[PDB]
Amino acid sequence: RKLIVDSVKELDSKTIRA
Amino acid sequence: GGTLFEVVKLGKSAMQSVVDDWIESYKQDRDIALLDLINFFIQCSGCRGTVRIEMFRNMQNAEIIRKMTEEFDEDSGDYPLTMPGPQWKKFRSNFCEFIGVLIRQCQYSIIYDEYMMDTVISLLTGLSDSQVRAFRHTSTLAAMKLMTALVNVALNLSIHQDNTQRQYEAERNKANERLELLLQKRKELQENQDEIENMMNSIFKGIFVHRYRDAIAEIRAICIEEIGVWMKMYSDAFLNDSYLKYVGWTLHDRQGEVRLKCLKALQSLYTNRELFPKLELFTNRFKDRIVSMTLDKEYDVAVEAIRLVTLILHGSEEALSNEDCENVYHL
């Protein structure tokens, strides 16, 4: 299936540590 | 006859013609026009299915979107908002102009009928929650342009509120019939403001605060670019810390296209020294990040950061010269 589907939709808080 | 999506893509007639033609069908049959507008956002995302009138009357936005992913009928990952070429670039422009003109034409009656806006915002919110990037990308852009259009409606209301207040005082300086009429119109315009802000609140808390931290770079860039528009166009309502915090938190984005949207959103604010008091806490908090972006590995990001730091320095107390203030206040 070629329809783009994102499992996780948002940036998690464990990677907003930038 | 052509569908609402296919008319905007072709871009033959003016977007106002399409908007006015839709409004006429809304006054003839609200459900038929809303079903066309619902399918407009579905098909603008690349989906080729069609929401049946029976689904619109018996299903929630949750199940409807689940059915439309089944009927997407695609042949690749592409969807209109990621298609290359100037043709789909004019589509994106026409798609955004349609959303703005739609609310502009509806801003004096239809927008307040508790049916159209509730139907549109509920659909865009559900689409902004779908894992399908085509639905989530297309509706987020549509919600951002919808919010800007609603901000313009709120600015017109305030202008109208002040003039209705001026008319009330002019009549009071002479109760009678006109005095009662002007009071009810003031009460009416205040209720309009509470509805428009309720809609803007639904879009911000329901879509923005989730999509500004979306996993896809351009979805974050779409949100950051539009919140800078709101703060520039309605600074009395949107230029404060509770809104700036989203731009400041996004300054550390891994993608240069998103960091550039943050800096360009701040730049249009900092070019107005009358907004520096509203930005003082933000400046103190994100001072170190902004100066660090002056040597960003992305050239466009660094150039805009240098441009931004230059405005901050020019509007500070250090840029105030003694001999100039002595020059203005002499004799």
Residue numbers in the entry:
A (entry chain B): 322 to 339
B (entry chain C): 84 to 257, 263 to 419
Copy text from the publication:
The complex consists of a tripartite ring comprising SMC1, SMC3, and RAD21 (also called SCC1 or Mcd1), which associates with a conserved peripheral fourth subunit that, in human somatic cells, is represented by two paralogs of the Scc3/STAG protein family, STAG1 or STAG2. STAG1/2 HEAT repeat proteins bind to the RAD21 subunit of the core cohesin ring and are required for the dynamic association of the complex with chromatin. The STAG1 protein is composed of HEAT repeats, a tandem repeat structural motif composed of two α helices linked by a short loop. STAG1 and STAG2, therefore, function redundantly in somatic mammalian cells to mediate sister chromatid cohesion, an event essential for cell viability during proliferation.
The peptide is predominantly in an extended conformation with a single α-helix formed at the C terminus and contacts STAG1 around the C-terminal ends of helices in HEAT repeats R1–R4 creating a long, relatively flat interface spanning over 40 Å in length and 1,000 Å2 in the contact area (sites I and II). Most of these contacts are formed in the extended N-terminal half of the RAD21 peptide and are generally of the form: STAG1 side chain to RAD21 side chain. In contrast to interactions at the N-terminal half of the RAD21 peptide that are very well conserved, the helical section at the C-terminal half of the RAD21 peptide is amphipathic in nature and forms van der Waals contacts with a hydrophobic patch in the STAG1 surface that differs significantly from that observed in the STAG2 complex structure. The N-terminal region of the RAD21 peptide (shown in green for STAG1 and pink for STAG2) is highly similar and forms multiple polar contacts with STAG1/STAG2, whereas the C-terminal helical region, which forms mainly nonpolar contacts, is shifted significantly.
